[PDB]
Amino acid sequence: EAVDQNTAIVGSTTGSNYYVRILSTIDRELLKPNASVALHKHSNALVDVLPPEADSSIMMLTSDQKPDVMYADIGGMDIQKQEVREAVELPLTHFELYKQIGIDPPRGVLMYGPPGCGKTMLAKAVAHHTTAAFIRVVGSEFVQKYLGEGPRMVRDVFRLAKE
Amino acid sequence: APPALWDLAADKQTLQSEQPLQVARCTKIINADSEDPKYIINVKQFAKFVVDLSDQVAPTDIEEGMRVGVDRNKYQIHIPLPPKIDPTVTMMQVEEKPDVTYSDVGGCKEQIEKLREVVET
Amino acid sequence: TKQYEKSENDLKALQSVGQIVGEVLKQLTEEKFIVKATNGPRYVVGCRRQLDKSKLKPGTRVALDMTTLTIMRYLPREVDPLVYNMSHEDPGNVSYSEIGGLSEQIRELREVIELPLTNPELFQRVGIIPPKGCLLYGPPGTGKTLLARAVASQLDCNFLKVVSSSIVDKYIGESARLIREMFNYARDHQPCIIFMDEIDAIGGRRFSEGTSADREIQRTLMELLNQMDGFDTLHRVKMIMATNRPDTLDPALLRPGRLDRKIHIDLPNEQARLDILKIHAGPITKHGEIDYEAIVKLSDGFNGADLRNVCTEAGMFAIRADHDFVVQEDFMKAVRKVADSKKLESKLDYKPV
Amino acid sequence: THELQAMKDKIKENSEKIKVNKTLPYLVSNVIELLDVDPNDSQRKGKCAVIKTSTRQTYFLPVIGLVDAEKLKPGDLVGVNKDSYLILETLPTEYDSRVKAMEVDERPTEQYSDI
């Protein structure tokens, strides 16, 4: 956080928060509440943040290989697809239709019930429907030997989602 | 404090004696021995250290699984430390001071007699 | 003569301090690269002029300088334990088909495991996929390990052996990346084969929720599935797991996919007892005129080593008789006695389906 | 033909320079043997093996120097001096403490005749 002028506190990659005098050039726009900023070796000086961002390790996508499953199986109903059509592509990118009716669409999707499998079929099937960046990580993927890197990884994962 | 005056005033000889043994960090366990001079030792820093021992300690006093001192510069063995153990668990285990003498018995003879000769006798 | 001074000049090269390895992430610009050491700190540092374009990479392990932290030369990897998994060997071919049973189970992993390497075209032309996993449980008899074990090195000199002792690791066990490391070097061998033995320990069930040790068991399972769920070699690699009873698999591993094939063992038959006999003869020999049917018939439903023990137990009675061979009358004595003693210990052969 | 004894003195004199480098084999480094050649970019050829350190850091050093690659398959326990990262000798045997030897028993005071 930015505590006052000419100086601010920055957590080190090792996890220890450092209180450092900021550089006199840019004190404001690239500061941001939470960001990854480069520091000097000995002095840990605040100079420049990321663009943002360089993102993080691991990877994304990989679901574009094709083919998986065609959505035409439920195409005969049209009672099921109408609720799906409103819950998939319109929540993806649409703007003026929301503020009008005033309903705020939720981001929540929770899948329970296996067996059977389901799931990833409709995942790569959405890849046929629409094209977007898919972040795929196991729940244990961010478990490491230190607890200082953990909060940064899940932050770097969710900060590219809003970006 | 008057008891704390001379108590705190003893740091002049302390800092003189603080320079030796200052490097004893940390307690380290050894592993095996291929030859007499050199032994492999492991420390709580997770880093294992092969080293020889100083001329002040005989090699025969180093046994497998013995925590010994160290000189962080030279890594050599300094002084052995007998306790390897244990974190906590002692304070409830250790019992001291007496109470409840033999005069509190309620008249049982043969019972308390044959269990007295198993330990006290 | 002068080769000693050459080694002395090599000691002058030994005076150079070793650099520190690291994992790159990405790049902000050509002058700013983001590297992360194995210890976990990240460093944005400059680079020197001697490197090449192959240094950049999409997050490949590199070494960092001890001062500028610049990358000199990238080392691919390092592994201490790998060599201990390189040395596993099993015979057959013949010694696999000599186990005497079950006859169709020898005909199973023959074409399932060994065949994909010699004739991969047979599966891809017809369009049928080979199984990516199998499960061998027991012990209704023997052969849970051997059935998959002999075909393991029969595919090629390629094999990688996994012991359940390496999964538990230590407090805050880092073997999560070692399960990735062990499978990473399992892909160094092609086509790869994966074993898992005695999963009734490391296969901890989440039915009744226990201490977090059951959770880290699932995390080690996540490291198993992830790399085998690729995005990488999948149909080419054959994974094998083994258990005492398959109630520990949970609905995930009980399902096919991860654990596909389930195979048990049955008992031999008459006149087939003479078949499995010939391969159990081996080193132990006996009198010229004999009939082995009395030997093996008295022991029914026994391990192949148990019958092998009966042959040695009858052979260790020979040294008490100070003769090389023994008549079959004293044989049946030592055969029947020891065999009936094993049957009282045969309890708990009932296994859940 | 007598020049062999002349060079034998300078190798023992330089082996004494190895002695001060052999005291002491200060730390344990897990060994991984590797053989790779790097084209430049004149030609630099040599055998270099990636080394570990039990401190959880990993380093990179040329093949030892002294004891050659004849021993062994990638090991551990070897001694190496401070930050110089040179391994003088490959030291056995395995590890660790009570794991190596569970219990040391010479012989019991009783014999099989006691039953």
Curated annotation (Swiss-Prot), chain A:
GO molecular function, one term: ATP binding
Subcellular location: Cytoplasm; Nucleus
Residues where ATP binds: 113-120
One of the protein's GO biological processes: proteasome-mediated ubiquitin-dependent protein catabolic process
GO annotation, cellular component aspect: ciliary basal body; cytosol; membrane; nucleoplasm; nucleus; proteasome accessory complex; proteasome complex; proteasome regulatory particle, base subcomplex
Keyword ATP-binding: yes
The keyword Amino-acid biosynthesis appears for this protein: no
Keywords carried by this UniProt record: Acetylation, ATP-binding, Cytoplasm, Nucleotide-binding, Nucleus, Phosphoprotein, Proteasome
Domain of life of the organism encoding this protein: Eukaryota
Family, per entry: Belongs to the AAA ATPase family.
Function description: Component of the 26S proteasome, a multiprotein complex involved in the ATP-dependent degradation of ubiquitinated proteins. This complex plays a key role in the maintenance of protein homeostasis by removing misfolded or damaged proteins, which could impair cellular functions, and by removing proteins whose functions are no longer required. Therefore, the proteasome participates in numerous cellular processes, including cell cycle progression, apoptosis, or DNA damage repair.
Protein name as annotated: 26S proteasome regulatory subunit 6B
Organism encoding this protein: Homo sapiens (Human)
Taxonomic placement: Eukaryota, Metazoa, Chordata, Craniata, Vertebrata
Portion of the full sequence shown: 94 to 256 of 418
UniProtKB/Swiss-Prot annotation, chain B:
Subcellular location(s) per record: Cytoplasm
Induction statement: Expression is not cell cycle-dependent and occurs throughout the cell cycle.
PTM characteristics: Monoubiquitinated by RNF181. Phosphorylated. Dephosphorylated by UBLCP1 which impairs PSMC2 ATPase activity and disrupts 26S proteasome assembly.
Gene: PSMC2
Stated role: Component of the 26S proteasome, a multiprotein complex involved in the ATP-dependent degradation of ubiquitinated proteins. This complex plays a key role in the maintenance of protein homeostasis by removing misfolded or damaged proteins, which could impair cellular functions, and by removing proteins whose functions are no longer required. Therefore, the proteasome participates in numerous cellular processes, including cell cycle progression, apoptosis, or DNA damage repair.
Residues of the full protein shown: 73 to 193 of 433
Subunit (UniProt): Component of the 19S proteasome regulatory particle complex. The 26S proteasome consists of a 20S core particle (CP) and two 19S regulatory subunits (RP). The regulatory particle is made of a lid composed of 9 subunits, a base containing 6 ATPases including PSMC2 and few additional components. Interacts with NDC80/HEC; this interaction is detected only during M phase. Interacts and SQSTM1. Interacts with PAAF1. Directly interacts with TRIM5. (Microbial infection) Interacts with HIV-1 Tat.
Residues with N6-acetyllysine modification: 44
Organism: Homo sapiens (Human)
Curated annotation (Swiss-Prot), chain C:
GO cellular component, one term: inclusion body
SMART domains reported for this sequence: AAA
Gene assigned in the entry: PSMC6
Biological processes per GO annotation: ERAD pathway; positive regulation of inclusion body assembly; positive regulation of proteasomal protein catabolic process; positive regulation of RNA polymerase II transcription preinitiation complex assembly; proteasome-mediated ubiquitin-dependent protein catabolic process
Subcellular location(s) of the protein: Cytoplasm; Nucleus
Role description: Component of the 26S proteasome, a multiprotein complex involved in the ATP-dependent degradation of ubiquitinated proteins. This complex plays a key role in the maintenance of protein homeostasis by removing misfolded or damaged proteins, which could impair cellular functions, and by removing proteins whose functions are no longer required. Therefore, the proteasome participates in numerous cellular processes, including cell cycle progression, apoptosis, or DNA damage repair.
Keywords carried by this UniProt record: Acetylation, ATP-binding, Cytoplasm, Nucleotide-binding, Nucleus, Phosphoprotein, Proteasome
Name of the protein: 26S proteasome regulatory subunit 10B
Sequence positions bearing N6-acetyllysine: 36, 170
Assembly behavior: Component of the 19S proteasome regulatory particle complex. The 26S proteasome consists of a 20S core particle (CP) and two 19S regulatory subunits (RP). The regulatory particle is made of a lid composed of 9 subunits, a base containing 6 ATPases including PSMC6 and few additional components. Interacts with PAAF1.
From Swiss-Prot, chain D:
Post-translational modification: Sumoylated by UBE2I in response to MEKK1-mediated stimuli.
Highest taxon in the source lineage: Eukaryota
Compartments in which it is found: Cytoplasm; Nucleus
Disease affiliated with this protein: Deafness, cataract, impaired intellectual development, and polyneuropathy: An autosomal recessive disease characterized by early onset of deafness, cataract, severe developmental delay, and severely impaired intellectual development. Patients later develop polyneuropathy of the lower extremities, associated with depigmentation of the hair in that area.
Subunit-structure text: Component of the 19S proteasome regulatory particle complex. The 26S proteasome consists of a 20S core particle (CP) and two 19S regulatory subunits (RP). The regulatory particle is made of a lid composed of 9 subunits, a base containing 6 ATPases including PSMC3 and few additional components. Interacts with PAAF1. (Microbial infection) Interacts with HIV-1 Tat.
Similarity comment: family membership: Belongs to the AAA ATPase family.
Protein name: 26S proteasome regulatory subunit 6A
Organism the protein comes from: Homo sapiens
Gene name for this UniProt entry: PSMC3
Residues represented out of the complete protein: 63 to 188 of 439
